[PDB]
Amino acid sequence: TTALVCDNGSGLVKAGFAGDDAPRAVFPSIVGRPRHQGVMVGMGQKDSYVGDEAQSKRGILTLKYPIEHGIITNWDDMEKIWHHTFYNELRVAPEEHPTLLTEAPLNPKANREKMTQIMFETFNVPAMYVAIQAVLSLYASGRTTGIVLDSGDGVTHNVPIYEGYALPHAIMRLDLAGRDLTDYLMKILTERGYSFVTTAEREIVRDIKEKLCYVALDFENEMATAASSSSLEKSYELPDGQVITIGNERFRCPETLFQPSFIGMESAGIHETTYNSIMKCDIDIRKDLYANNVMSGGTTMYPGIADRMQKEITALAPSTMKIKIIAPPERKYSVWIGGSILASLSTFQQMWITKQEYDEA
């Protein structure tokens, strides 16, 4: 009678228990099947690996990402991931636990129904619910009206929410997120003269991104500062022992979010999509959206991103608009945290769909 919260993303599954302040399990949303026949010493033949073990044994596997840009597109693989979540990661019997699952903004209704069908028919949960990711991030911040920027590994959305109601006509989706940023960081470090050839070397770049990158408040000025002095250089020590030093790549990498042309995309950057999303909404609620711009997801973790968003939105909005960016320290887990909260509220308990109900539908 303790509920589970499972937040499935393009890159990571965040899974845990309702009432806790953080997921117990965070791991790659990947399934790999052996390309050849054989065994690890002391083990039997495995048909598939999920999560961390799939990544670390990837060279003998074929990997699949069953969640693409936030949406489940491979159901047999998704079943494997949920199987692995219940039994291996959380070590629970799913038939014993009401389960809250999350979904992307604009998830097709047929997709939510397939989720529901698997949880009941395949996993035998007593009860479940599907919440929209962005709405949970907003809830996590103690609010019911605002606009969420949710940027993860595979997808970025803007979601305006009016008294708990995500406004689907105003939702913006941008197919540029953490993965594109890692790939671009690798490209530009390579241009500098570094080399990421082996799997181990290439794996490091994601860590350099997460430890050293940041968003410049004034990109052009930050570029001239970087050319002028070594004040923005930072060193990163490789696992072996070699230390390497990087300057302007630190802020060129996430500047891509504001200038998607850096990776050859012709789309509006995240400040433009935030504005255009607010502008699809009734003029009468815009003030409430501007004053409550909640950032959520791994790719919103860059130092500086909130200040730069405050600046770009200020330049686009009416001159008298009060503008506020909320970026909680925990925002890489905000969706999960909002789920943990919602599933623990007393007013939520009538909202679970039960096995009995599903059978009678």
């Binding site: 009432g19 997921p23 919602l342 509220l345 007013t347």
Partner: peptide
């Protein structure tokens, strides 16, 4: 619906994991 949004705004105390 109103009761729910009320609780959401008021917050819950979450435990250490």
């Amino acid at each position: 619906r109103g009761a729910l949004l009320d609780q959401i705004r008021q917050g819950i105390q979450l435990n250490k994991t």
